[PDB]
Curated annotation (Swiss-Prot), chain B:
Residues 11-268 form the Protein kinase domain. This is Mitogen-activated protein kinase kinase kinase kinase 1. Autophosphorylates: phosphorylation promotes ubiquitination by the Cul7-RING(FBXW8) ubiquitin-protein ligase complex, leading to its degradation by the proteasome. Expressed primarily in hematopoietic organs, including bone marrow, spleen and thymus. Also expressed at very low levels in lung, kidney, mammary glands and small intestine. Serine/threonine-protein kinase, which plays a role in the response to environmental stress. Appears to act upstream of the JUN N-terminal pathway. Activator of the Hippo signaling pathway which plays a pivotal role in organ size control and tumor suppression by restricting proliferation and promoting apoptosis. MAP4Ks act in parallel to and are partially redundant with STK3/MST2 and STK4/MST2 in the phosphorylation and activation of LATS1/2, and establish MAP4Ks as components of the expanded Hippo pathway. May play a role in hematopoietic lineage decisions and growth regulation. The active site is at D131.
Length: 289, 285
């Protein structure tokens, strides 16, 4: 792992803020001599966080090398601040893109979905769960390539971890099975596949299904026994293969829902002519209308 | 029957009792008769459904169990629900033990019996308390024991808005993930565990691991070789209290005894458990 106990503002000039909230800030940063653009995730560290196991996640991040997951370059630890230096994806998220470009073509969506599934197939074989597949978290570089973020080690510490404890409340009276669920949730690996199903509709239609309907109402509808999963609005615009991809990804029963590996042999995503050219056309549409 | 009327017409709000996520709670006097009640003010927001709200209130009205705080009525003035309830004048057992110090084994056994009677009722009504602790076991001036009810108040207002904010946008969330985000791992038998820990709390002024960080406690509890808590001072307490703690604090939920099963346990089925034990406590003040 080797977290360098040094100020990263010495080594990179922070150009521009990209986003943040609970986890911390993410900046666009230039490598001072070499001119390489990176993403610096500044994480707020707090005194009761273990530095020993923190390095073991960073060791997993270093030894990991999958193409559809954002690359880890290195760690700095200056004044109660972990800085995770990462790959920069210069076009932003697909949300940032679609809000300017409008809806993606079926081919563009098919390529995105294949690249996400390759990322999800890798994370699940490493016993991890993404937990948050949406348009806003699928990043696009200038080459038209597709990258997932990784909120793995950032979830285990800091202000996002303190947020997850604050709603849970004092744990001292809580039973073991209640505490088990308070850590995990209902999140297993296959919920990412559902979430991709919703994402593909989002990219298709500029919104996930029920986005105009109250969050609670949606939660109750989802849980009630005869909940029909969502579908694409405009049947004729999309091919049968896209409809089937949405049907099978949005299987209600987790036991019966296909895994990332199973999904990569689906017609929509195994078809030829799916490559980054499709996204270069999209990024061109962002510049030239 | 939610009365579309101002409750400040019918009651004088005397004094604030505390708290504020679930709602703010005032001690209130009935204007003519002088009867004391507890009024829980909840701040409501415009997209809260009044239809199913009445069905919980209908279950609360038709309910008449003695160990659960009694529901008197609901009032709805300007985007503010006010839930009129039974008053318990001695406060919570936490408020009490912070002045009195530790309860005797007999006092604890009486509290435990009255809570289990409440929990046996709630579980037969398919509900779960979710929050059995010293601070939520109330004591009236008669020495009697009442559980609170954060049932319908959890389904609306600022506590409902908080539960949505941490869960985050549900639109991308899978059904099984949403199911767990509503329920939790709360089943009925977690209240029995929670009472087990409450009995220790009453015994020792703190739950077990109170000086250990919340996260560390959550990870310890979940890891495979987690030993449940026990009482510190073996000699001070009887074997029956130790067994009550051992069986209530069973890790495996399938093997952990229900409220009904627990009421026929030795500690709480013994004679001489009555409100006199708590009158002695309230007298120590
Ligand atoms: C020109 O590059 C960008 C423009 C914009 C956005 C993102 C980028 N690039 C970008 N590249 C790489 C990463 C990375 N290694 O993780 C990243 N992370 C990130 C950013 C914001 C929040 C959380 C995270 Br995690 N972001 C995000 N949008 C919301 C506004 C525009
Ligand atoms: C002299 O009576 C009291 C003194 C005090 C406390 C409680 C009481 N009595 C009391 N009786 C009944 C209820 C009820 N129908 O629910 C209640 N509600 C309540 C009050 C505060 C918070 C949450 C809730 Br629910 N409160 C609470 N303590 C923390 C500080 C002092």
């Amino acid at each position: 792992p080797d977290i360098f106990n040094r100020d990263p503002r010495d080594h990179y000039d922070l150009l521009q803020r990209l986003g943040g909230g609970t986890y911390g800030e993410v900046f666009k940063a230039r490598d001072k001599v070499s001119g390489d653009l990176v993403a610096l995730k500044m994480v707020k560290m707090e005194p009761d966080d273990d530095v020993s196991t923190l390095q073991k996640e960073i060791l997993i991040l270093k030894t990991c090398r999958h193409a559809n997951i954002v690359a880890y370059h290195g760690s700095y630890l200056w004044l109660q601040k972990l800085w995770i230096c990462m790959e920069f994806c210069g076009a932003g998220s697909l949300q940032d893109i679609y809000q300017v470009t409008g809806s993606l073509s079926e081919l563009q969506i098919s390529y995105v979905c294949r690249e996400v599934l390759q990322g999800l197939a890798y994370l699940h074989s490493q016993k991890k769960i993404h937990r948050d597949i949406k348009g806003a978290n699928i990043l696009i570089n200038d080459a038209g390539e597709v990258r997932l973020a990784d909120f793995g080690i950032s979830a285990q510490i800091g202000a996002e971890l303190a947020r997850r404890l604050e709603f849970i409340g004092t744990p001292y009276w809580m039973a073991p099975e209640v505490a088990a669920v308070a850590l995990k949730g209902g999140y297993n690996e296959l919920c990412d596949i559902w979430s991709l199903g919703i994402t593909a509709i989002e990219l298709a239609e500029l919104q996930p299904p029920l986005f105009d309907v109250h969050p609670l109402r949606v939660l109750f509808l989802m849980t009630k026994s005869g909940y029909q999963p969502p579908r694409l609005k405009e049947k004729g615009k999309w091919s049968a293969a896209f409809h089937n991809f949405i049907k099978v990804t949005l299987t209600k029963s987790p036991k019966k829902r296909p895994s990332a590996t199973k999904m990569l042999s689906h017609q929509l995503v195994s078809q030829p002519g799916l490559n980054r050219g499709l996204i270069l056309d999209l990024l061109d549409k962002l510049k030239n209308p």
